[model samples]
Target chain A: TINPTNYTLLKKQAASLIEDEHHMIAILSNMSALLNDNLDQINWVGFYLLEQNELILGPFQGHPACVHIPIGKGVCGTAVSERRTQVVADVHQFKGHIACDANSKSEIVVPIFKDDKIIGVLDIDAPITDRFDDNDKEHLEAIVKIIEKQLA
Target chain B: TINPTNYTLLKKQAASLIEDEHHMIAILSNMSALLNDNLDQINWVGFYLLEQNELILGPFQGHPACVHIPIGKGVCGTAVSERRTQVVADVHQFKGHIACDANSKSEIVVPIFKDDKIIGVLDIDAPITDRFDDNDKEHLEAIVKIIEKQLA
Candidate 1:
């Protein structure tokens, strides 16, 4: 599951659903629901937008999330700052873990890009320890790649 | 412990947080997150847009949800069709309840007007049966009223 390339299936699932939808809000809204329905053991999944040098919560699934995350702050921020996928095994152990939900034991943050610049991130969390591995990271990144054109 | 009118404090909390921003998506996004943080025993909070005369899911907190609901279907659609609030104490008993999430036992849906016409709804769900009472109905409606001007 840790193999990043194994996400071809998830990428396919996302491609067919969002291929023709150009509306940002509408596409992202359905995407969250689609991923939630297709994925397992995940407590939260959603996006955070980059605005005014901070990450503002965007369309998302799971419990209500923390609204504003500054650069270099939490998992979401670190992913955006580094412009890479962040896979965490234990959220509590991560310094400054913004405690959005106490039940979330692990998380994965993938930055969404357009025109070689980052716009936002796809954040997914789970309750079981080390719930996300490389496949999730690879799969979700591929998932975002398909939607990048619309977002850009 | 459940004071219906006691929402005055919560209303104030909501007003202060949202008074400064008015972008429909931003306001609703923050509002959902704020409401979830301020209120307890709730599992989901988000909005549904009335696109093409149907309720399409919008920005939300909690698990993924049903995507499109007809004008007169389900609790969310019923609220829009009737142009009022649909506060269900027990979802299972409600006729034609669209079970978006199997865990939601109780729910509330409030119609949001954009121009004296229904544009969407503010939806919240809970994991406990009979989670929402009259107080919740009045309080949430009151809270929406404060932010209605921006959305409308």
Candidate 2:
């Protein structure tokens, strides 16, 4: 079943949750869990933080994921390179898509900003094609904005 | 059904998985996912890292959890204060047990070490009482030791 998530409520929860914690890793860790708990048809939800010009795996809910991804390489990397959200309805058609989990069919990657620069990305992958829509991209970006404000 | 897990194989997998990653958070994130995938009857599987005399939530596979636990307080904190694994067959009956999730009936908290000091804890919670026994304590301890070595 598709998730009819209330992004407004979710965004509020994100702001309140991250506001209570000062640890960045801890903040991202719980954010991933929150997203996984609320979303549907998603096989993976997590973050990849920028480190030394590469994306390093952060907290996630899914199978063991690729630990390292170079900048501008894959969907997660492309989000950073383009400095914008990447919402792919079908990942197979996307050039240079890195399949971290075979169950993933559709995907969304939202860049997390801090200090007016991209610091990481919020990545969600669904098992069915066209799982993420413009609505999801819009709300997810708002949610990431909450995260960035708290992290900053 | 209870998990009749082949922990020997799991231990090897833990070592192999952590060996491939240098980032500590990424390693713990995947390790929690690995445990959640293999374990039965478990509702939560993750970590609480020691930071400034408190247990901060680490990468985990479960619902959003308690992010900050003081040392010497709850089961996870006690593991650090006592410097040993705390295997509670019935969390409801345990003294000073922290109920991060009401669905968690039984729990096992194994201390992760680095340089002979406690760094964090591998905490697993099952939906039924008496979920973790001596064998689980032994094997999970061994697994945490592998994590400790790799982090060191």
Candidate 3:
């Protein structure tokens, strides 16, 4: 399990990694690796950036994914279109939930904003149902905040 | 506090209510009410569908929202173009995070799919930062799945 010190150290390292560079790809890659290594009960972790009304896959550490997602479709697009977080305790109950990975029973998506605009998202998948919770949302949001500041 | 049984009963009732409906307005209104009553930590909730390569407003509960969102621009478009979940903790940091509601501090999006194609999105907004997590993502995705099946 990740302790407080571990989280702090990880954030510090991530901050340093992005501080000296302006390449979002590199920063996202580093973040993906960090989440893959530290977070538990996670099956897939990666980044998806918005490109012209669609979701395009960014650097990710998991099985292959859908290359393009149309706006207002699927879990990712729904979140963006609605401008809110979409959380599900059971994927089966969600309408229009895409099965990028049949094994992925649980998922979370967080939109990444820049200058008060939605640019991209941080997505993580898990093989277990109900794997994410309020605490996880809080933690992931904190991590994304770190990344967002680093990007700026 | 909503007990699990009540939540289940509500879910069942909602499913039945929307089972035979095709009116986007009605579907979304019930959806908004469902979310408002059931989900916690939500400030805004709504829907967006792809129209003419852009996002058209569907139904929502909260502050007014953007009527039209172009593909490949803003969070809605980004999620649509990429076809992936976009979760943002802080809307201000996102370069194109559309502020339909200035009060929305964080957002999550889920894409809707049908017949291996994207149909639209289910979006939820939050006034507080770090309002979403991995659990939210998973649960939201599940909700999308149920909605999709109903659409089918």
Candidate 4:
């Protein structure tokens, strides 16, 4: 229910915002901040890095989260293993759900890739069920594309 | 009242654990996780870094928070400006309590020092009023000192 000319606007800003910022970690940290500052109904928004086929916790904006997620385990892992977007309307019902934050009811994940290779992902969680819609999925993916553009 | 022999054990671990890790961001991120995993009743724990006379958000574990805090503005800023711990029993009563998150009701801010220069501050926030007590203040301060020892 919170879709608009939102990501369209962010796409413009992301280009200029991270243009001169060269540090990868700093860029990711601020990107999460930007998302968390704008998005509503989301309880958590952050990044998990991929290293040696595993997802390591990166800069995040949420309650402390699980540090290491294997290649193909929970929702985050599944999204990684498939190299695609995961939009879970209900996280509890998802197989191999790793309950990092007890308050998170629904979750969405977008793969973050750099140089045609997967670097990490953008992970988001919400307190209520079905908090994310197709609009969210599309916009978030577009946002990831812009992120790659900046890094490129 | 929280004299559980835990902080003593943690002080030793914090010293030895981070001895080999040289990456500052990784060290702080894991520290937040340790605090989050071991503690209860708190909603957030993280660091705010001093850069160019402003406190920029650093590695953290909580809902998206205020990104930039000026010196002497809020709990974190005051901690830096005074070079001391600012433990507020209730955030609502503290003058100019920057509401990073609307739900946070209490907070504790400890200054992080390096080579006698204030580098950053460790900030913890809770959702309930008067959540942090003397025990928490003492333990967290001790923990920050151990962190400084490693970074030094």
Candidate 5:
């Protein structure tokens, strides 16, 4: 048995951490650490910022990841293409899945928006199957809302 | 009784990992993870990019950290100001030391140069006193040298 994540607190902390900072790199760098420290059973927590139709790796707290992913390619890119979150219970089963880390069995990618256009994504990977559910998707989206407000 | 780190191999791997990538963020993000995964007893591994006279947090593998550090302020800043590496056996004893992670006892900051100008600093922190030696400083600086060649 494990304690449920207090996403409300997490969201508040995210806002407080980045509210005064205008630098996107600094914001995402610290946000990755905040999520990695607070979350349980997560192997990777970071952001892939969109630039020129490609997601360039931002700050992260895990094994070295793939640096680039074109739009509509992997789970992260799919989120941008569909303009919605993609929660894969078993990443292996997801066609066209790009294995940045072989240890990652499941993943949840939340598309980040600013001014009604998708700019980047907050990607989290878990080492177990079915690690993320609707509750996580909803809360993680709320967390991204806090980050979006800080982004220019 | 423990095997010493193969820093030569580590340096080679660092070069091999970033040789093909031109994006600084992607290179530093993955480099941070590579160092964290290979090093022993280190609590934090990351880079603070020099931007507009202040050090901004870049890709990292650690807990949330202080975002803005002025030139000549802390260990990281001191490295930039002095234009050399700062290896502290005990962070608490270092005057004006910035306590980003309370658990970090020892630290080494190597100034990164691009075209003879300071671009950033690669900061590594350990949880125990005197964790880094002269060997670490030489090797880490060598690693930074490889990274310097890639930076624009």
Candidate 6:
């Protein structure tokens, strides 16, 4: 049970790290580490960036994932194409669902922007269905905001 | 009307600008400018960040704004504290209204997040009633998603 203030601090720290932009790989590694270190119930945390209008794996810390996603396709691509945060409470129910890791039962993707444009997404996968709620969306959104600033 | 691909491009451009880091001020400036440039019936376009359990001014492109607001206190604060987007077609009708900008007849506050935490809001005010619709909320939410990332 974390207080809102502490949650805010978590976001600040995460954003600061992403903003440092030492390298995409390092950022992904650290982000995954932080997610595992801080939050519970998370099975995978990683990123997929836009490449030629599709979601191509950037740097992610998780089990092996699908290497390519067409635009307007799966959860990750739909989040980018629609420009909205996508929270799938049940991955099995989603048509055309792309399962990079079979254990991933729920997922959330917050589109990452660099200048007002979505460069990619910060995607998190969980083993529990319905694991993400509105609060989680707000929290991830905040983290993406920090990353956006760091990108600047 | 801009096509989805073009809109995506526009957002991507914004993302690129955000990545520069030195462009933080530029982002706020452009956001304010967009508020001023686009809407015809609005009275204010500004932002407030959650700070120490209060809302503090970040950037604005309208009349000078209230500098501080306690959480759960006013319209903007309520949205932040509740962690939900609030759209008031008429501010005067809102119970416990906080009139930071008296000319504002309608307002839409989109909560900004970082790592699933609510840190601030993107607020737009208007002289007319019901200035914000569902599409506005969806689009603005998307825009804020980008802005939040840029700020990070």
RMSD to the hidden true structure, all candidates = 5.4, 1.3, 19.8, 6.3, 1.6, 19.2
Candidate 3 CAPRI category: incorrect
Q: Please provide, for model 2 over B1-152, each residue's C-alpha lDDT reduced to its tens digit, 9 standing for 90 to 100.
A: 78588898999888877995789999999999999988888999998899988899999998888889989887788888999899998988878876654567889999888888788999998889999999888888889888888889
TM-score of 2: 0.96
* lDDT of model 2 at position B95: 83
Scored by Cα lDDT, where does model 6 land?
A: 0.69
lDDT value for model 2? 0.87
lDDT tens digits, residues B101-151, model 5? 356798999999887899999999987889899988998889998898877
TM-score of each predicted structure versus truth: 0.68, 0.96, 0.47, 0.63, 0.96, 0.46
Which digits, one per residue and each the tens of the lDDT, describe model 3 over residues A1-152? 32332566666666664566555654665566667767777767777778767777665555445556666777777767877666656666667777653556777878787898778788888777887777777777778887788676
Write candidate 6's Cα lDDT for B66-108 as tens digits. Answer: 5677888778987887799988888888765776646778889
Compared to the true structure, candidate 6 yields what TM-score?
0.46
Candidate 3 Cα lDDT to native: 0.68
| The candidate that achieves the highest DockQ relative to the unseen native structure | 2
Give the per-residue lDDT digits (tens) of candidate 1, residues A30-65.
678778777777878878888888888787665555
Superposed model 4: Cα runs more than 4 Å off: A1-5, A101-103, B1-57, B61-140, B146-152
* Chain A TM-scores in order: 0.88, 0.95, 0.87, 0.91, 0.94, 0.85
Please write out the lDDT profile of model 3 over residues B24-66, one tens digit for every residue.
Answer: 4445545755675666777667677776677766555443345
| Alpha carbon deviation, residue A81, candidate 5 (Å) | 0.9
> lDDT per residue, candidate 2, A1-152, as tens digits?
79598778888788866986789999999999999988878999999999988999999998988888888878889889999999998888888777653466889999998888889999999889999989898899888888877777
Q: Compared with the true structure, what per-residue lDDT tens digits does model 6 show for residues A2-94?
A: 323356778867865565353443454456456545667776676777766777664444443555678778888888888999999988787
Order candidates by lDDT, high to low.
Answer: 5, 2, 4, 1, 6, 3
Q: Is candidate 1 or candidate 6 better by TM-score?
A: 1
* lDDT assessment of candidate 5: 0.88
Ranking by TM-score: 2, 5, 1, 4, 3, 6
Clashing pairs in model 1, backbone N/Cα/C closer than 3 A? A62-B62
Worst 10-residue lDDT window, candidate 1 chain B: B1-10
Q: Tens digits of per-residue lDDT for model 5 on A1-152?
A: 23478998898898877989998988999999999989898889899988887998988889988888989888888888889999999988887677654667889999999899888899999988888999999999998988888885
